[PDB]
Design a binder for these strands. Structure first.
Length: 138
DNA sequence: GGTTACGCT
């Protein structure tokens, strides 16, 4: 069952639809910052005053960092782009040192958890709630 | 495994 990002908590597995706001690749992992334009008390409060010029929104507690390791990394690093919509399934949540929610995709060759992330065509009806909520913060 | 909300690789 899918959760809105507002509904996810730490130390569970969850699935959701989101829009990709920011990507960062490194030689250790691939990082996504995603939002569905719902607020979560454990998300970082992105500041409109000091955040990178490049981050245009959403501001406040509206986005979550996803760390993609291993195959998830190799698959998505030159595939998932800022602006894409994605569907993430059975991913892990945790809490970073500072106490903020974060989503993790660990390498899972034995396919124990059946995790996955895929692009969702911008015209899928599943994205309509995201698009309407987005209008409120732009 | 990797740190912090920027970097723009």
């Amino acid at each position: 069952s899918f959760s809105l990002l507002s509904q996810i908590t730490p130390h569970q597995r969850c699935s959701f639809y989101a829009q990709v706001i920011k990507t960062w690749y490194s030689d250790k992992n691939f990082t996504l910052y995603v939002t569905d334009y719902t607020e979560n008390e454990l998300f970082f409060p992105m500041s409109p005053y000091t955040s990178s010029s490049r981050w245009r929104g959403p501001f406040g507690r509206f986005s979550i960092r996803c760390i993609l390791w291993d195959e998830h990394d190799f698959y998505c690093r030159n595939y998932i782009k800022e602006g894409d919509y994605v569907v993430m399934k059975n991913v892990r949540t945790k809490i970073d040192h500072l106490g903020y929610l974060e989503c993790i995709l660990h390498g899972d060759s034995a396919k124990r958890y059946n995790m996955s992330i895929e692009k969702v065509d911008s015209e899928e009806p599943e994205l309509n709630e995201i698009k309407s909520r987005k209008r409120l913060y732009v």
